[PDB]
Design a binder for this molecule. Structure first.
Ligand SMILES: Nc1ncnc2c1ncn2[C@@H]1O[C@H](COP(=O)(O)OP(=O)(O)OP(O)(O)=S)[C@@H](O)[C@H]1O
Ligand SMILES: [Mg+2]
Length: 741
């Protein structure tokens, strides 16, 4: 029993190493400490200062430099006793301040212990290196063990959810959020891995389930500056089980795919993997059949400067990709056609428009055009026309407009994005067909989406994601509320979100999105019309809104995680997500069997006519609706720094994450009440010695508990006698720990 075998890798990689003695005395020390900032400017940089003395109302300690300072007792960030260093649950700390929470986390991360509970949450810090804790043998250990029975681990959370499901006959949810490169995806794959093993048919379906990711990642993931394998879409995976607890199916829901990246990538970034997998993996044969070339040869791949990922083989990845398509069950035809699309898009990107003639655009060279049309199976001349001379409705009239160069270009780009986005939807639906069960008994859904996003530039998509985030945070808070309430009750112990939410999605008065939809009808509205209307309704009128002192194209929202400034450029376009009808016509006719789908199926070809914002709001609401039906589990993934490096846990970086993600809030809140809630028996074991009275092992543990306390002459308001646990307010237990044997 590896859990008891101090020599196992379980013990090596998942636990704080244990010595021979457990004796209370070892940890004996006379010294007391505080967490201080050696620069009040840099607020997340603390040092530990021993406390030299105290006053009736303050503390006076010595800094690192031998420098002495004074602090208000009431402002002190007291350091937990060393015994607490490395606890598995932050909920176990007596002093629950910020430097303190960070310190426990860091102690743990320094031993490569990346998972730590914080009440209801599982906090996970990206190690940025391999830790062999995801083996089958590792899977095997977590089977049927209570949270409190094993070390923190994604597997653990997964096991709790699965037993809960079987036990309570209730659906469950695992919400894995955090920033780019934080490890959401990695953890998501481990949850599925785990389920697949604990509940799989001891597997074909299990295989197809697994192989679905890989497929999605090729088309929806890319190299960005924050992550070599960034998910440029959000997802909600539903793992379906039958009444007996065996995996019966699955369904996936995708959100917010970054279609833009298809036509543009920032420097050092790559387009989606697939492009490169195809280009490096196609047979010298398919190449020619696809008119393929290097990446350097394609405008959509030759701009970021980056065409390769360190320690990554696109060709090798292609195989893999192609392999999964196989498993899931994509026909060769389908497969070819999918490639053909990937290919055509590449060709479209290579279309050069020139002017001269007059002002309208022209295609002096038709090579690219020919190639794209060819692969798509559409008519080049029709394509040509639909791109540069779209017929447009002036009411009665349906007249062809001759587009200029840029406009022509923007249209081809729009075609490309629709192709990509639609193909992605189609892949998803294809997989679901295969995997999904109409009739299922239970499910455990996993959400793998970004947490709050606050970049340099925040656009429409950031607002969306941040809106989702407000909803999930408010979901957490409500949950936390019942759960925390349930508990006190069981032992016999005694919003702002809404306003932000309304600001965004309100119908009356109208919020940001309703105004944006309104502006959306008018062909002639502009980003200026839009932003002016926004300021007209909320500047000094809604407390969550801020009109900037000088910018004319931005506005701020006070979000849960703090203010975000958004820039309004292109929102109208984004909101409508326009594609010329002649382009729809052109492609509808596609000889291609798959192409035909992308344009002929309203479930793929269209939104409903709904705006992009309306659709987003609608999908978020179903989402939450579903979640409302489950028993949720929260995973907070934390990036340790901005460099993709191991052994480099940056306080500022980290602290920031903890503030925004609800971890520090939960605590502050928990802190307020009775944070420490110990099993009577557990208390006594550790403290019997402190009282000229009590024996380590007593059957009357509550009584034994009242002894030490009394021995100790501890304050009654500082602790609450719970049926099973002893509830200790903040610092109390630290003091107690701080007592003589
Ligand atoms: N437990 C882990 N062990 C080792 N590496 C990990 C672990 N979790 C994440 N990583 C590393 O971190 C990288 C990025 O993590 P991801 O799981 O892709 O992040 P993410 O939160 O999905 O980020 P996005 O998709 O950009 S919002 C991985 O590809 C690994 O290098
Ligand atoms: Mg991801």
């Amino acid at each position: 029993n590896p859990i008891h075998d101090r020599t196992s890798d379980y013990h090596k990689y998942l636990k704080v190493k244990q010595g021979d003695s457990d004796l209370f005395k070892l940890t004996v020390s006379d010294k007391r400490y505080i967490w201080y900032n050696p620069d009040p400017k840099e607020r997340d940089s603390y040092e530990c200062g021993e406390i030299v003395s105290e006053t009736s109302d303050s503390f006076t300690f010595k800094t690192s430099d031998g420098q002495d300072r004074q602090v208000k007792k009431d402002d002190a960030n007291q350091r937990n006793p060393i015994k607490f260093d490395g606890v598995e649950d932050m909920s176990e700390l007596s002093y629950l301040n910020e430097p303190a929470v960070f310190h426990n986390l860091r102690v743990r991360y320094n031993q490569d212990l990346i998972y730590t509970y914080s009440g209801l949450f599982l906090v996970a810090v990206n190690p940025f290196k391999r830790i062999p804790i995801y083996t089958q043998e590792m899977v095997d250990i977590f089977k049927g063990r209570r949270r409190n029975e094993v070390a923190p681990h994604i597997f653990a959370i997964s096991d709790v959810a699965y037993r809960s499901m079987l036990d309570d006959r209730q659906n469950q949810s695992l919400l894995i959020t955090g920033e780019s490169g934080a490890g959401k995806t990695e953890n998501t794959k481990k949850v599925i891995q785990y389920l697949a093993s604990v509940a799989g048919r001891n597997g074909v379906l299990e295989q197809q389930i697994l192989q679905a990711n890989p497929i999605l990642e090729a088309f929806g993931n890319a190299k960005t500056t924050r992550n070599n394998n960034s998910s440029r879409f959000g997802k909600f995976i539903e793992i379906q089980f039958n009444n007996a607890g065996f995996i019966s199916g699955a369904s996936i829901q995708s959100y917010l795919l970054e279609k833009s990246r298809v036509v543009f990538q920032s420097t050092t970034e790559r387009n989606y993997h697939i492009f490169y997998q195809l280009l490096a993996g196609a047979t010298a044969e398919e190449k020619k059949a696809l008119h393929l070339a290097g990446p350097e040869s394609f405008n959509y791949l030759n701009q970021s400067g980056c065409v390769d990922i360190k320690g990554v083989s696109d060709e090798d990845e292609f195989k893999i990709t192609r392999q999964a398509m196989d498993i899931v069950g994509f026909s060769q035809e389908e497969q070819m056609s999918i490639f053909k699309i990937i290919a055509g898009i590449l060709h479209l990107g290579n279309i050069k428009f020139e002017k001269g003639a007059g002002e309208g655009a022209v295609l002096k060279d038709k090579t690219a055009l020919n190639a794209a049309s060819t692969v798509f199976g559409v008519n080049p001349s029709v394509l040509e026309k639909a791109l540069m001379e779209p017929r447009i409705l002036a009411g009665r009239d349906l007249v062809a407009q001759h587009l200029n160069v840029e406009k022509s270009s923007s249209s081809r780009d729009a075609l490309v994005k629709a192709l990509y986005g639609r193909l992605f939807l189609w892949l998803v639906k294809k997989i679901n067909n295969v995997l999904c069960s109409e009739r299922k008994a239970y499910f455990i859904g996993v959400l793998d989406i970004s947490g709050f996003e606050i970049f340099k530039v925040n656009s429409f998509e950031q607002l969306c994601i941040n809106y989702t985030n407000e909803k999930l945070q408010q979901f957490f808070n409500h949950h936390m509320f019942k759960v925390e309430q349930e508990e006190y009750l069981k032992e016999k112990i005694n919003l702002d979100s809404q306003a932000t939410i309304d600001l965004i999605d309100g119908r009356q008065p109208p919020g940001i999105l309703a105004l944006l939809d309104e502006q959306s009808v008018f062909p002639n509205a502009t980003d200026n019309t839009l932003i002016t209307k926004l300021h007209s309704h909320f500047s000094k009128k809604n407390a969550k809104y801020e009109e900037p002192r000088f910018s004319k194209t931005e506005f701020g929202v006070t979000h849960y995680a703090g203010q975000v400034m958004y820039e309004i450029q292109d929102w109208l376009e984004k909101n409508k997500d326009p594609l010329q009808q002649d382009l729809e016509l052109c492609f509808k006719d596609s000889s291609d069997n798959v192409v035909t789908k992308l344009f002929n199926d309203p479930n793929i070809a269209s939104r409903a006519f709904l705006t992009v914002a309306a659709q987003y709001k609608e999908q978020l609401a179903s989402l939450m609706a579903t979640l409302e039906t489950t028993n949720p589990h929260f995973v907070r993934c934390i990036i340790p720094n901005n460099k993709q490096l191991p052994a480099k846990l940056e306080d500022k970086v980290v602290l920031d994450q903890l503030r925004c993600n609800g971890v520090l809030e939960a605590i502050r809140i928990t802190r307020k009440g009775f944070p420490n809630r110990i099993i009577y028996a557990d208390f006594v074991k550790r403290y019997y010695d402190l009282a000229p009275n009590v024996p380590r092992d007593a059957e009357d543990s509550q009584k034994a508990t009242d002894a030490v306390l009394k021995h100790l002459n501890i304050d009654p308001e500082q602790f609450r006698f719970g049926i099973t646990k002893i509830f200790f307010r903040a610092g109390q237990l630290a003091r107690i720990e701080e007592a003589r044997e």
